[model samples]
Target: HKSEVAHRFKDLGEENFKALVLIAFAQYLQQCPFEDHVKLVNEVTEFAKTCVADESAENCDKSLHTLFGDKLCTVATLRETYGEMADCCAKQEPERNECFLQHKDDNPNLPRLVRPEVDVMCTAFHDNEETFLKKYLYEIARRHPYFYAPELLFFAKRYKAAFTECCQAADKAACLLPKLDELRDEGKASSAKQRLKCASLQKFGERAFKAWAVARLSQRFPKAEFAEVSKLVTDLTKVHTECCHGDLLECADDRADLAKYICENQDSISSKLKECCEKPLLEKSHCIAEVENDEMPADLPSLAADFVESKDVCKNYAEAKDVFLGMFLYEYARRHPDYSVVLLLRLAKTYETTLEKCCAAADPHECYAKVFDEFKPLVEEPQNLIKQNCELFEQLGEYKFQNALLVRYTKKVPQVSTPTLVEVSRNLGKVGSKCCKHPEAKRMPCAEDYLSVVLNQLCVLHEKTPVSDRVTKCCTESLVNRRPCFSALEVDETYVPKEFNAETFTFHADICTLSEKERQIKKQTALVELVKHKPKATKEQLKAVMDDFAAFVEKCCKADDKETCFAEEGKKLVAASQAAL
Candidate 1:
């Protein structure tokens, strides 16, 4: 019966609220055999059912309840009272659950049983639930301080029975405050179980109150102390700890608001404790903020949009800070490459989530500015910390000394201008190159390769700055090679070309008086005879013949066909070799 009613009214909307109320009242009457209760239920049920069937009964409950007493308009009274009970139960589910958990097992007759009416009342109220819960929770804390203040484990059994049997709604408003004070009342007599319960309850109440304060006062009153606002934080913490593990008992709205506020007012709330609180608060806040908004779960785009719209300045800063931090840590991981390094890398995930909240709250330009501003410092650092971090894993050898020297020198050098991307990557590459020659160094690591980084750095520079004469001259003067360094394959120089001498060769200086025609005739005759009397011979035989030819030339006085002499002798050697074969 509790589950049925809890399920039905939980989804009720304002338009159909009275009709739903009528249905619930009838169901409650069916369970309660009291004659007066049955009569009251019947009358209210009649009016509500009539209204559901007719458009004319829009204001029937108001008119009937005010004009007619419970005797004549029992259904109307039932509707009104049921509405009130539902309102009460709906708002204080967390608190009632807190009560149930604190006392149900010990006291079987706790008001929070899973009856038909209880479940129905639990589901009926929907709008402004948090506000209702807060009020209801406060009331519970006020009336039942002992139970809600010190969270008792045994209390949860009672609360669970009541919530499950008497209420179908989530146990969101539970607070074990009254139960806690009850333990304290016993003082030295309190059992270990009660003490633990008390501590747990106190812890939850404190958290809840802190969350509530951030929701209300963070933006308007940055300097406000949570302690001063109320002891609700203590009360809520007690309730939360007791109910934290229960289904739907957790109230993340206030917690989320607190995280949001903390992020927004980082300058005011940057203390370590606040940061620590924010971690869980933001996590819980995510549940309440937008994750459960749609039919399908929200994903990156939603988170990203929310991240931009977030009002927390701290969140924004965190986002920016994360962007740079991730880059540095990534480099750090690369440098270290150990289990510890991996663990640190994993730990940064928490920071990343924090930054996500910050980024979600920023605009596009601010997003760009955020990353640039926060990361700019790391970018500007002279010694490449990223490379230094990764270098720890490099193999031990002669290069190890070089790596040590690099670390030492970089540490010694006074950091000046922000490091150029080139410098950072180069420093890393240099270290890797130095240590890389050792036999045991890992194969093909990112550190050992400089080409990709160099290219990328160049691309960024080209995009940002245009070249001019003077600007280029500074680079030329400063850069060792005055140009991008090249590989061996990229260099080329060969086959030098020269002009023809164009000078005519003569046998003697006495020939200088010879006529131009005579010189031409002499040049022509030198070649013509050279080919005409060419000899056919093998290479060795050709050498012998050439010797003989030279003798004949000296004796006979004329030259022979030059081209034919060489060609014929070469042909003769080929024929000789073939004939011998």
Candidate 2:
């Protein structure tokens, strides 16, 4: 029976093979019982494989097709179909039967793939675990993962213990501010904000001290000079200002600039950076803690144990070993929330192996001379890495990912009322489906960004609800008031809709509680930034445009029925400015 079906469908080839499978799927949907539907389709796909020629196995892409004369069947279309089928199956028995019967003939003439609609830009990159890990892991691994050892962990342990004791005796924030006692006694008062800034200064100083001490301790320098520590701190501070607009928190950007300076002046600055471990550990655990104040709490011995234990598995091999080790380290971090020193040690052990395998120099000190080049590429061009792996985003399509996200949220917030979760999930699904239906959805990079944004907002909404009653009350009130409590998800920074006029403004104002002055301030801030960045006008012209903008806002931006006022009138100013150019 198998051979007969195979011979009959053998010449069906790749395209027709897909065509037959889709046709068969639709047939099974119409008559088969709901319980057996998935099982039946799996069996059909297996059977369909036999119908294809041996060549089909070489480069089979069942995910996409222009089959049935350029209908552009794709993974998106398959997902859309699945959602539709699922909906049909969710109905009462008679209605479900009728729905499936109607779709029975919808085989080759399947509904075209729809893109998810974008309503807002979500930029909370540091809000969630997965995204933050992806963004910062490489930087951390490159800077401090190599330097971690049983001996070095004590510095962190002692530092924290001293700080905790100081906090117990004095104001916690005051104790954290370096030299607070000295500065305050001299009548130079400080606030928590000022203290925060001073903390950064202390951290940099500490880093310089570590470098100087390590070099001196190793007997590598002729003199254990206090001036060396001062110079390194000064250079680091100068580099930070030049790169990060003097913002202590923007360490990643500052590091990129610092690395550039060190690489360029390697003739001299190389030795200075090399005093510790080459570079000031811009992504180091201690450095990051000074800024974020959320470092994981763990003692030195346990952290040392993890590194020592990983030595066998972490040492040796080529690029493949490094890659696998990175994957393993990330998996470990994800499992452990506290982000203990053990994580860093584990990461260090892996890099230690890479040093053994990749570095050819006999001296362990000189072994990683070329390792900087390897580490630089991994940390430097993350955007390119994202581009290469972007295909993974497309694999989920639109509907499938939306559904999966909905399931995840439902499972995540099990404390929330089931009915509320259902409503929220459906709303998100509709938005995602509409977004993917857009023309620009074909590009992998754009799709990935859009997906990231959607997921980020969803996570924010999930976190905002900390209690079960909050969920029940929010959802119940939204339904009763005929309003969306989580309506922030409807905002797309890239595309403002034509209907977002005064009525809608008032609608959201009721929810956002934004006053007229507040709205004016928000709009003014946007206009100011736009004008500042795109200074296509002189002082006089800029003043004249501001007057016009103020007039336009007063007339159209605040009217009761000024439908599409911002979208319609804001463009006139933009057009006028462009005309001058």
Candidate 3:
């Protein structure tokens, strides 16, 4: 039978009886093995006997009836075993909570054994203090209607029991408050005082914590108006709840959780700070505001379109153009939130390397701006130009650092088809290869004028005729001087051709000049004389003579010597006779 113990204790008018129960429950609420279960049982037994007289009636026999049953003898036996179990869990809270939880199932009728309030409070308070307390502090006002101010204060204070059980870093009182004083002076409401106040008001529940937080925030920003200070406090609390209960910023080891959290939550910070800060904390608030909604991700085509649209403004801030470029590319990546972080990092490195190589300089803005201006047309939509052309533009920017001649040419020149662009490539290649070695060619007056002339010729030829044999014809005709042609060809086609080689030589069979003709005649005369001396020469010896004659013609093919000009002409006669035989 559930003792009429409540009726007996009601009018005993001994408030100490209630006080003893509160103390015992408080220890039990902590659920650690350090509580004196034996002492608690003795106190309750003494109170019950004091109230109920011997045999006055059945109600008078309320000698703290069994905690789980009606029999006093059974209660005595159960308390003894409960004390022994409590002793086993004296060292660890985890073990203590486990022991209580384990024992609760053994007997269903124990007075406090299955208390819903204990189960609700204990799990949350012990498992995660910061999140649990902060969350429940707000919930109690709505979910706990019967618990008024005093009851709420008592219960909230009881929730702090979990912190005292273990010396875990997160459970320490110092860890609860934000580092408020780190920003302000030694003037008012330092974190130490703020912490003391928070604990005091903490008993009153969530509103107390909010009041303390706002007070501390106001102290830090003393110039802030009342509404602004209140708003900051509210926003800060929301940020804390959203970001893992603010526990993510606490670590036992020597790491910077706060710094990491700030950097990662720039977007969130910007949004909140903007709501309260209007124009008060301009620098600090806008630092957070700078990244708001600006991280929208983009693709290649979209990036190109934006670049074209902003080309003029981009050019104006040529000194800090790289900042603008980095800003956009970073946002473009944010658009890909679903991709793995590793893949995103790899993509970032790709953009970084390209930017580093292209805009790498003491003056990054100037470098990027110059490259941007020259390549602006190519990047415009419908052009769909790839990285190859952009890379070429990078090289050209370096080559023409002093003059905007290339910049001007691109701006003024009309669009050309593939073949016309191909011809321009050959022409530019010719200019670069020959004039590149000229003294100070990139800056020299003569070289500049000559280059300008060449570009003019290129402009004239842009729509003149289609190139039937772009590289092969150019290379075959030019022989040893095909580098410029190939260079031009590569940029126009945006690819390297197979015919390009640094160490190739070929014969054009063009007319030889005056001196080259004499050397050919002399070599032919020597070959004829050698054949006469060996009239009975073996086939091998005759073939060697033909081979020597061919070498002689190749050397004199391009010369000022009139006699050597017909060297190939004479070699033809010798070849016709040799084949006939």
Candidate 4:
């Protein structure tokens, strides 16, 4: 009797949880050969029949004791494995098994498994491959808690196959070590796919996003206390908020906060980030901060993903529009990793609108079938323009470059007011300020997104009045065309700009009698109007002339010979304004 063995297999949860625990064990067992797992199958069957039915803790403990034994795994892992399997149980039916195809495992705290050593695994396998196989299956659960049984189990089986091939080699470490990194990457990509899939579903709705994030962080830091887990969720939300706003300035620091945690927590880094820690110590933290969150397991529940491809689409849509459209977004999001978050959201919004129109039609499927066909060109053009624009914006710092953009845009439609052109140009520069902080790979798409705001504003201006054939075409072509159109546009040689008004900076000193606030308000209006008339003035030159007027106004306003002061200062201000031109 193994009665002396302390019960490391903690008691299972309520019936719902027990059901999950059984499924987790059952599905994982299926991954091995029938000859191999058939003995444990009989042991698992007895527990549900005798032990789990009556809330009998003794039976539960003894039965689990028999089912998993001293050498295999702990009850903490049973709980961890239960987390992934529960996704399958939440589904309605037949397809639920397919969902099993997605787990092998939460947050009650998975006891950290010691990182398995290479020699230990090989030596164990050399002694008895089946025992090593069992260890591999259990360890897989700890590292990849989000995987479906088939996915992680599949990885385990492949592990055995790889070892079998490598054992033939005289140098096992050389053959097996390199293969270890390769398989690690492959497993990571699979997990990343799971994360992207979950992220897709999470994109369309709020609670899904929250739950998905908690699951991801739980996997990342399984041993942390629950309250601490909640803290990481806050960082997750910050990343979404700042990055989604296209505010890469805040996003950068938000990202740094997360990266710092990984580096600062000695245990957390060693357990999860071995891929990054191999660098020279000086560069290790730097490299870690820039890397994307990789190697996550099945991120989203399989239940929602199933609904997207279900046969009763309109029925579901009519009853639950939020979930219906939310899943619609989820499906689209998983595939397009390069698309900016704003663009993906907009595309999903557009798709939602399309369904609103198309689903009401006589033929919903037929109308919706071709929905995305035309959008490819529409998306590609802006993507190209964004890269092109950001490339130039980076080289041309804000004031100089944005003004350069201003000249190109204003020259194409010279009929627009100079003041409006300068105003719009400054706004474009702010877009660069916000979007350009993004890492090089992600920078342009963000720039393209915020660029829409300024371009759409310019579009409204041209649409309000008569415009040239080229201007009209660019404005009317499509929303996507507006940004690129300005970039490649021809000069509006036919259009003439307004001549400078000499009186713009030579305003009367009615401000001398006014309050300080009132005086600056009047001064502010005149200064902006001056930019309109002398729109071609460089900032330093414009400010130099502005100082000239302010200087003259200071002396003239205080003078006792007011009439003489005003007439004489007027000459100085006019000369300064002219010099600005």
Candidate 5:
């Protein structure tokens, strides 16, 4: 039952349907009340049915032009707004409404909603001549559906109430005209927040702003896929870009499109954001402004980092500041996942700035080396955390990195959940592969970006409980200092639940009886499982214990007493595992 205007009329061919729409809208503009609106339906339909049956577009054109003759001013609004609403009527019904709403949103020349002098407005309403106030209200409301319907009704009710009472006063203009300010003030208040966001976007450069967008998106839309998140971030960056440039209507169109897209995909965003998506056209635009941002912290991830002592800082920067600095932050970020992108961006900016000042000297070497003393306080706590992990991946190879990550998370957080832990750990191994395996120069940024996403998730997911003072603080302060905070953490010695046990480490029973390739694969899987179970042991101790267990695997598989040998050895190994922890 697509009984909405377009669907109800779609059975008519395109030419006929558009003709009926043109005629009906003409009647609507002529101040047809609901009764008159309903009354004209048969007349327009009869025109369409008879004109089409007779194959005469001339009849409909005649009526359309006659309707236009009485309202010359409306013709301008039509032409100024999207070539004309007639352009909208030409589109298929499916696209018509959205096209019309966008036309309302995209007009750069639309009038500001405000009050004229009371003397001008009051006299026009006082005599109630030509329905002056009625015409005034229509002009304000028509170009914006934001001003339409219930909102339009409210606009009139207040104006009508004030004008009636004020006209009779001793000073007619003073009494009634003060209400004009109410309309202007009412609008001013709602528009204030959007200005702050655009201002901040202007204040912080796009890179700094987008860094937060990357980090901030998670809490609002964690279920969103990585690619979708990237798309939203890209479009969102443009909103601030164009908005801060004073492209206000362009900003409105972008906001409108963003809200429309997100609303169409409710499953991807937080439920709290739904309030904006479910509103009427103008109401919807305003509500989305609230959700479009939380805050863009003006001072986050303060900068400073070593970019090596090369004089190329001045040399290469001249040719390509982008590639040079971008490369620096990637390496810097991989080593500090807790550090925000904005923080690293600031770090890149200063490195370049230092080069600018000192490199200007006749011989810059002394200044280049001396300038870095100020950034020494960066205190890389989250720094040390990712620092140790990347090195571990470098030293231990792919399989160990996976085991160590699984073991570290499960150990620190206490087996509250396994699936997500395993998921993040596996991704860590993948990060290590991309970052660790690449030539040293290329991998750092890839590691930083890809690794931080999962790292942030780990902090959010695992530290929900006050797991420890260190874990709690690092996770909590992540907005400003997560990388630095987390970097300070030592190897976790936290306890696991009794039920978590060796269930994760249950081995392949016939593993030693398989081919070399098969046996090697199973043994590594078991090692990861073992680390996951025995997280209390130091990494050195864990490796020591696994070596002993591997010796037992070799002896038992070769012996005729394999069953008895395995059973006895497993008990001793459990005792040894307990003793080692």
Candidate 6:
């Protein structure tokens, strides 16, 4: 019956539902006696009456709690001097202290009754946080359907409260940096346990501020600006991360300085925190700091689209950075060995204590051997071939280098290019063959056997610049001969121009490349700005920008791009410049 009602009754005949809503609203207003209090009273009453009293309601409890708590509570408050009722009605509060005191004394308290002790520091705040959350989050979501919005607010406030409380007890500021991965956003149910963890830490603070700020948010702006506000709450949490992780503490004494620095040119930082309060969500163009040419910290997350999709490069770079982090985790474990350390020891036992952490923001990313293990076997045949005969591998690396060949042509994805696909057949014929097989060749166990991983990697480089077959063959032969001395520096140096002749410029070519689109998307946006900004142009100036842009384009393109098109395009730019008067 419940399911049926949920499914069928939810299917609305618009007129009837509209009429019912209007009728309920009218009935709500009719019950409210205050004529001028009509707006406030009607809003609350209508919301309250329409609220679902059972589990099916969206945010019923959230609404009732708010209506009875913040909005109506404030209006009915004895806290103010004005708006008092002499009889059953409230009028402007009396001037006499005694008169105002009695009326103030007569009014009701907030609907969500919280202990005063919980509102001071954060320790007490934690003890009661779960109770407060369950009541406001789960209970209200179950009981009141119309006020569904409060659940989001509940999470935001609860998280903030937890951080404040946790910070007070456990170096709240410090924890913000070290335990960033553990932080959870509101409404994302996956973070429920984190909320519980935070609540557990509330007892150690000087005074706990009751979770009333959030309670007030839910009550006052239940629907209005909820999305925008929720975003602010999210961003504030990020800012908190910055304070804990970034260098915000350096300028903490001047509140305005910190605020200006934060709200300035940082789009991601601004967007993330903007929703927490009532500030307008500024567009990138409207950023005050940008408009005024004020500086924002570069470490700020880009306000571009989702970080996952961002070619900003940092997100995907997490994989590479993880190698260092794996070492750090292992060392951290050695000092205070735990499960994380024991697990990391299974792989990457090599990078050891050498990893230095500049600060909390600089994440020493953790490495997982499982990925390499999974990756190695597929490409192991190429790896083994390279390993078994270093000379052959070096020779092969040279040949593959000249061919600018790819390890996997990857017929599965048309996006990959042809010239860079020497190993594509092997990868496609066998899975996991497109992995890294550098310095770790023989020492690391390869489950999927055969070994040309490094040769294949070199093949990727060969495809673009057209390394000499002798270079490719030399690389393969070097690997085949077990000549471990081959260094990237030795190989890379060969590509540089031996002399800077005004008449001659050679392609500093590599097989791995980005699409034209990727170049424009990554380097072009910034490059365009530089082009537009430079006042004078010399061959060196144009050459320098093009080089910087080439490097930028290379860095931003994904691992998938085998042929480094930006280098090729960069060569073209140089060519155009060299030809220029």
Q: Mark the regions of model 2 whose C-alpha exceeds 4 Å error after superposition.
A: 1-359, 364-553, 557-581
Which residue runs of candidate 5 sit more than 4 Å off their true CA positions?
1-343, 346-372, 376-394, 406-422, 463-472, 478-480, 492-539, 553-568, 576-581
TM-score of each model, in listed order = 0.17, 0.22, 0.17, 0.32, 0.37, 0.17
Tens digit per residue, CA lDDT, model 2, 1-581: 32433442453343333333333332423332333433443454465564454424522322111111112121233335445655554455445444544443322433332321111101222244323222222221122211222112323234334344544543544454443333322211112222323334454543333332222221221121324323443555555343222221234345545455444543432233333333233323223222221122243123223322343333433445534343334333323332222222333354656556634545543444343344334332333433433333357654344434344443334444444454455445544554435433123223332333333334335556655443444433311111223322221223222221223222122212456445533443333333333333354665566567667767664666564665566577556744553
Off by more than 4 A, model 4: 1-310, 394-399, 408-427, 430-441, 448-499, 502-581
Reference-based TM-score, model 3 = 0.17
C-alpha lDDT of residue 525 in model 1:
33
Tens-digit lDDT track of model 1 for 1-581: 21222222233332233322322222233223234443453455555555545535554434321222223223444344434332323323345343333322221222442323333335543444433332333323323323322122223224434333434334522333333334333331233223333443455444323333223222222233333223333444544454444312133333444456545654443232333444433233332222211111123132223323445544445555633443333333323322122133333343455455545654633543343234334232212433443454354433333323333322222121113322433344454554444433232223222332343343335336633332234232311122222111121122122222212211332223466545433433322222122212233643444344334333323235444443454355334433442
Q: What is the number of backbone collisions in each predicted candidate, taken in the order shown?
A: 79, 17, 19, 9, 14, 110
Global lDDT of each candidate: 0.34, 0.36, 0.36, 0.54, 0.54, 0.32
**Compared with the true structure, what per-residue lDDT tens digits does model 3 show for residues 273-326?**
434333222123323323222222233244444433444433433555444343
Could you report the Cα RMSD, in angstroms, for every candidate shown?
A: 35.9, 27.8, 33.7, 23.2, 24.7, 27.7
Error of 3 at 342 (Å): 4.0
Point out where model 1 deviates above 4 Å: 1-38, 55-581
- Candidate 6: Cα lDDT at 82: 32
Better of 1 and 6 by lDDT: 1
Error of 5 at 407 (Å): 4.8
Clashes of 2: 17
Shift in Å, residue 366, candidate 5: 18
